[PDB]
Amino acid sequence: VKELLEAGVHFGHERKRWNPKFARYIYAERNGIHIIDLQKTMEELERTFRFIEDLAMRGGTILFVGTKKQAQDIVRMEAERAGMPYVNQRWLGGMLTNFKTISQRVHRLEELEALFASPEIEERPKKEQVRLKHELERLQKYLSGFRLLKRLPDAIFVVDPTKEAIAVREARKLFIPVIALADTDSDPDLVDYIIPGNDDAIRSIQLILSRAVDLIIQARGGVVEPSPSYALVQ
RNA sequence: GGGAGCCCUAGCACAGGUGCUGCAUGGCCGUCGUCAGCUCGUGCCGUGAGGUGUUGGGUUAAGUCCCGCAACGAGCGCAACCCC
Ligand SMILES: [Mg+2]
Ligand SMILES: [Mg+2]
Ligand SMILES: [Mg+2]
Ligand SMILES: [Mg+2]
Ligand SMILES: [Mg+2]
Ligand SMILES: [Mg+2]
Ligand SMILES: [Mg+2]
Ligand SMILES: [Mg+2]
Ligand SMILES: [Mg+2]
Numbered sequence A: 001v002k003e004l005l006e007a008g009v010h011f012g013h014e015r016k017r018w019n020p021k022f023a024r025y026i027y028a029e030r031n032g033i034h035i036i037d038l039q040k041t042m043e044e045l046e047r048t049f050r051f052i053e054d055l056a057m058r059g060g061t062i063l064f065v066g067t068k069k070q071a072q073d074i075v076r077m078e079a080e081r082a083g084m085p086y087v088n089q090r091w092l093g094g095m096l097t098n099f100k101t102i103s104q105r106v107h108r109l110e111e112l113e114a115l116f117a118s119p120e121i122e123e124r125p126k127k128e129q130v131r132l133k134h135e136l137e138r139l140q141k142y143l144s145g146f147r148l149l150k151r152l153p154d155a156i157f158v159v160d161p162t163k164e165a166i167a168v169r170e171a172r173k174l175f176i177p178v179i180a181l182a183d184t185d186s187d188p189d190l191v192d193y194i195i196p197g198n199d200d201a202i203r204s205i206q207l208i209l210s211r212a213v214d215l216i217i218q219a220r221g222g223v224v225e226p227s228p229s230y231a232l233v234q
Numbered sequence B: 001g002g003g004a005g006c007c008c009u010a011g012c013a014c015a016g017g018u019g020c021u022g023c024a025u026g027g028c029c030g031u032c033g034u035c036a037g038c039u040c041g042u043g044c045c046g047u048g049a050g051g052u053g054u055u056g057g058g059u060u061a062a063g064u065c066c067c068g069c070a071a072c073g074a075g076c077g078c079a080a081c082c083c084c
C-alpha cells in the first residue's frame, strides 16, 4: 500500500489524442508522448485510496469495470481476491440504470445451474437440452461476477473512463462515485476519484489494482500476500 | 246449476315477412400470405412526433441461428408439440 518511485515505466502514456482537460496532470511532451505529472499521480492516489478505505470499512462494494483487453485478465483476479464484483467481458446497456431488468439474467444463471444438478438434465427433450445448455454458456460468460451484485454498488472502479464511458455515465445518473484509472485521453472532471496513471499497459494497471485491493483487504480484515497476477503479466 | 281439460266462433296482446340496410352488426369465410413479419416491458437517445432493441457482418425455408452492438429481455408469428 504505497510506492512512489513506482514510476517504474508506468508514469506517462498516450501521444496527442489528449483531452486538453487533462492538461494539469501532464509533465511534458517528451517525444510525441505526454508524460504524467509524477507527484500528482501519488497525491491524487492519497485522497483516492483514502476514499476506498472508508468503503471497505463501512462494508460496501466496488464494481470493477475493465473491458480493455490489455487489462481484462487482471481485473478478474483482483476482483475475485476482494469480494467485490467485476464487469470483464463487455458492459451492457443498463447494468446499473436498468439493474433490475438486467438481473433477470442473474436470476436465470443461478437457477439454470440448478437444472444441471438434477434429474431434469436427462428429462426434457433434447430440443430444449441443446438450447438450454448453450444459453447457460453465454450467461456465465458476461455475468461471471456481476451476479455477486444484489443491489447497486456504493462505488465503481473503471480502468478506462473513455473506453468504458457508458459505465461512467450510468454511475453518475445514479449518483454512484466513480473511481478510475485515467490518463491523457480522458475527461478528468467526469471522474470523482482519479488515479492519473495510464489506462493501457499491464505494468501499470495491475500495479494499481494490486495495491488497491491490497488496501481493500488490508482494511476489511485479512492482511494478505502477493497476488495471483503479479509478475505473471507478460 | 255449475267446473279442469281439449275441438270452436267473434273481437284483443301478439304471430309471421328469403321485404330494405354486410358502411349499424355478431358469427364464420375470402384476400394480401404460410409471406416473415407485427409489437411489448424496462433502460438509453430525442424539446417533440419518434428512435434504439428489430440496424451491422455470416447463415437459413424463416427476426432461422451465430457474431457483434445502449441495450437487456419478452409476447403474437417461424420452428416444434398432432396426423398420413
Ligand atoms: Mg484508450
Ligand atoms: Mg322480420
Ligand atoms: Mg363481418
Ligand atoms: Mg414459413
Ligand atoms: Mg395454401
Ligand atoms: Mg432531432
Ligand atoms: Mg427524455
Ligand atoms: Mg429498422
Ligand atoms: Mg443482420
Ligand SMILES: [Mg+2]
Pocket: B063
Ligand atoms: Mg424467432
